[PDB]
């Protein structure tokens, strides 16, 4: 009775993931106005199989999403990458950070369990700062 991210390429590999994207903590200042971009994809194939983002935060280095997600997954070979970007009108979003998650070892869980996860730069040349606060776990 939710909406779900993803169609099933085999639906006997597949599994309802449910996904809360609580908040960000500490984000770099590059007006700050953050959102998060969720791309499932596959592993290896660097696939895109589903992207969404949630609303943009006005002027905050600590935006509180609260926003729920769920995503049909292959806990073996899919991968989801959270991706913070700064929304911008006149130029392209700034990126903030990622934390790419691998499936293959998330607790299930029929519906203080979030994890904050240390934002990582695109690449080892840059840095950033900070956390996104997220809870992630399968439909039994």
Same mark, same amino acid.
């Given at each position: 009775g939710e909406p779900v991210y993803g169609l099933s390429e085999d639906e006997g590999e597949s599994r309802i993931l449910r996904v809360k994207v609580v908040s960000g903590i500490d984000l770099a200042k590059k007006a700050s106005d953050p959102y998060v971009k969720l791309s499932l994809y596959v592993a290896d194939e660097?696939? +895109?199989?589903?992207?969404?983002?949630?609303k943009t935060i006005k002027k905050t280095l600590n935006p509180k999403w609260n926003? +729920?997600?769920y995503f049909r997954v292959n806990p073996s070979n899919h991968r989801l990458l959270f991706e913070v970007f700064d929304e911008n009108r006149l130029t392209r979003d700034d990126f903030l950070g990622q934390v790419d998650v691998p499936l293959s070892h998330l607790p299930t869980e029929d519906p203080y369990t979030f994890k904050d996860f240390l934002l990582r730069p695109r690449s080892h040349k840059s840095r950033?700062?900070?956390f996104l606060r997220l809870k992630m776990a399968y439909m039994p």
């Open positions: 660097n696939r +895109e199989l589903a992207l969404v983002q949630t926003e +729920e997600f950033v700062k900070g």
